[PDB]
């Protein structure tokens, strides 16, 4: 909300109408115009509405009703021509003679609340005394609405005095247009959009106050970044004086609650001209005012009564006793004006935008002044806004504006506030927009936004105004011309792109893996990188497990989940638990996403200068500083792998299903994979395979550990797989198979091995002995029993032999089979079964 | 009798829309660039002409990575891929980039903390806003159809000048049909080209960044993105296998 | 604009059947001799109304296929006779189906663009050539292994191939 | 132990090369046209000069 | 086709697909790629 800008349409119309009398547009048209030039309209709030007798009244008599736990008043109100009405009200912020807005019976308040003559507290009640909220005028504050004295006569129309036909616009101003944080800037933009003559409400001719001498001793440290500091006092005001209704109403509609005229004029001028103002008590300043950096551990209590731990970079305002204000953020309670203050010293200062931004973010004080100083404030209007503010205070609360003025404008004193001139070709906006603008369009638009434009051949020299520090390069001037002419006039031309090379191998493989797993029944999960709390403790991982070395987020949305995932399984298992808890108990989920794995080389890199390309070493240290972020593929399974139906009872998920998901990924990656026994949490130590591509480990698969499943609340028998895709080398095979048409010989061999000999090792030994005649080998039987003997198992393979150039004989195939059996005997101790 | 022993799965609709967007731009001669999800501040902000101590940077909904002096973060947008692409490739460049992005926004009907963006970047001789509008019109035409209502209006991004936002008329928007922001775009800022060693007098460029989930909501008329981010299998299966 | 919907669907169907164990066959359009007699089709079966080639390489196979099954079954027989008895084959190819409007069109003058009616009579004269998708299965649908004895091909497998194509 | 209950199939290498060629030209902005296998002499010969 | 040869020109080509495959994969004899034996296709992968 730091970019917000609330202001009523009646105030905008007034400033625009000075240069263009009679200018008035519907709220719908105004919204579209602001959008067409780049101002986001977040909300359009109309006031009221009000129907029936809603009349300004005068509190004539107040009789306190005693006996209740709450103070209740029976009031008589003059609604005009001394025609009195009895009103029962529970508020206390009013006395006899105050102006109040009463809703008589028959009236209608927002929204739809019809007033009726009722009897409350045993007394007559011919209506109610309305509050600011009940009238849809101001924010919900305590008490009823009390108009300032002389605002209207008793009997005046409520909607007319309150200006309920007005419309309030809530704008979200982009941070490059700080000048639009005021009625001045937005009224100027409307004059640009409607091609109107604009009268700046901050100009000198709109006369300056006299300058006889300094107003107060002032010493400014130049390193604080302050660009200007102005002080003019107003002596002898009436503390009992209040601000008129037009001023309090405009502050109210802009979100600022009025307090006293000394403070109201500082906020009113801030909203009107964009320059924040601060009011000090002249008789509460002790000695020379000083602008300096804070000391190590220096403290300061602002006007809200909160102690602030100051930084070395915070710019302060101090005198000889205590700190008066945190520069450009918030004033202190020291020189703060109160009901005791009669001498007011007004402050108009231009602070460094970066310094204010640092301080307000660190102290969490995004005040109305800090939001504007953050986005730069026009330094050429400091004294002008000071004189406007001083005359307004003296006109409201009386007094004499002292003809003294302090105006620190740097050392040496700065007398020109315009940014450097910009040289731009005359047709440059036309080239960027792709439109042949009419002659003079660029020069006229740049003059509307306040720039001096000289012409010399084909080159324009543009000097931006002091309130437009964002205009630094020709591209900035291009934006001003195009947004005012309207972006909708830009044509649509598709660029002829050069011949591209399409998708890379890795991008294509990510698609193939996704298609293959989805067709096999897996549902894709987009896994959150924020780990569940305590997940590695649930897994029982050792303290030195590399998965525990996580990158941490400082400001997570869930305070207990700041660690970024080093593995995809925690998110997938969390997604599995959600589905199962919702009644979907047979799930296969997968995910293709990167993980975050920091190393000891993971570190921060200071700012690299951005006015040139980073060197090759700077690119290398930026890349080497980031944690490793390899792409992983992972999946989890639970429940029935095959559903039940007319075919049978289905099949529960088993570890072999995870092993097949590995082979689904491997075939989609066109790589060969071996699976080897392994122990690696959270997998079951007896049902866990480590997956290798060549001799490189790429992940694990199998059934999860039953203790992990129990502690995690997972379904029993849950299986999982996780592979590192970046460790799987991209393969581009070009097969050239030669298919032998000659008949095949089918033979089976039955081999007894030790029970713990892996079946793949027996097949490899058979294949190695069979030679080139072996076309296919398939294990189809694994048998244990007393026929075989203890600690043994029998494996039976189906062998298909085939010659490439002849009809293979039964004997020649048996010779290859005998050699296969001999090879199995030598390598895994296989015994031919008899 | 039923016959499906192996029930069909489903790739995620967000990923399937990304494939459709990718195919759309590849068919126009463009290519796909990539970048990590954990990024330096150098490429996420500084090289994108973000000021140092200024609300244009501070108001960002940034996930900052520990420790406090790390200048690391979860990337708030895919725009750091602009920097990586201009450093790694010769000109001209016509790429898009589809990846995840992270902001501290609470889940509502159109915002989620972990979402995806479609970035676009074109740098060449003589490119203008008309080429940017031509590209966005093809993007919108291929995803929303020839009857789609879009509008472009000025905005601000540190890495574009001029800058714009593109809205889409969202009929199924909760509370009534309205214009809803689709993404940001503009002409690549000369400071960005300077930070990548490119002469802004010889090359110009445009870039855009649209929400992928936001595109899906407009395309399929999904008013509330909760289901597309919670990972219930009942949300994905009606979209098909996606093979 | 890239691939059309129909081109994209031809790819998806091919991927889905291949991932389900099917091997693609590029089917010859020349029908086996006497195939419809082997099928016992009636004389008036529309599949018998075939377009014929005047000069086939095999004199006994001049008829162009009105259905993809004869070529697939011939490919199945080749694989089975070579010792590969558990086969699932598929094909995505057009067939040739002439009607009574199938006829020859005399030379249209080529010194100008053909008129819209000339384009219409050229297209209407060619036999209908719709794209078909077909598959055949034999032997074990699921092989035997450490999990069990496998499962022979049954009619329900063909019904599921329909649902693979439909999805 | 072996785990593949559903052995993988294969699209034809000719068709897969066609897909790769098609993708190559689509990535250059081209499109794919089609035509029937049984053709008239008009388009197979005469209109081709 | 009704196109003015003074305003438009064009090029066209026609290459063998099987011929391309033989050059790309080094297959000297195209017999196996046209006979439909499953042993020829399976080493190429699913192609998904
Ligand atoms: N929290 C979110 N959840 C889902 N989608 C989101 C969320 N935040 C933003 N988006 C989408 O992302 C789009 C762009 O978001 S943005 O913050 O306004 N703009 C950017 O991030 C810029 N990088 C876009 C840009 C602008 C100019 C040149 C290139 C790129 C929006 O229009 C949304 O559709
Ligand atoms: Mg916006
Ligand atoms: Mg600008
Ligand atoms: Mg922030």
Curated annotation (Swiss-Prot), chain C:
Compartments reported by the entry: Cytoplasm
Highest taxon of the lineage: Bacteria
Record note on quaternary structure: Tetramer of two alpha and two beta subunits.
Miscellaneous field: Was identified as a high-confidence drug target.
UniProt record similarity statement: Belongs to the phenylalanyl-tRNA synthetase beta subunit family. Type 1 subfamily.
Protein name: Phenylalanine--tRNA ligase beta subunit
Species of provenance: Mycobacterium tuberculosis (strain ATCC 25618 / H37Rv)
Gene: pheT
Shown chain mapped onto the complete sequence: 498 to 664 of 831
UniProtKB/Swiss-Prot annotation, chain E:
Superkingdom of this protein's organism: Bacteria
Localization per Swiss-Prot or TrEMBL: Cytoplasm
Family that this chain belongs to: Belongs to the class-II aminoacyl-tRNA synthetase family. Phe-tRNA synthetase alpha subunit type 1 subfamily.
Subunit note: Tetramer of two alpha and two beta subunits.
Record's protein name: Phenylalanine--tRNA ligase alpha subunit
Organism: Mycobacterium tuberculosis (strain ATCC 25618 / H37Rv)
Positions spanned in the full protein: 294 to 341 of 341
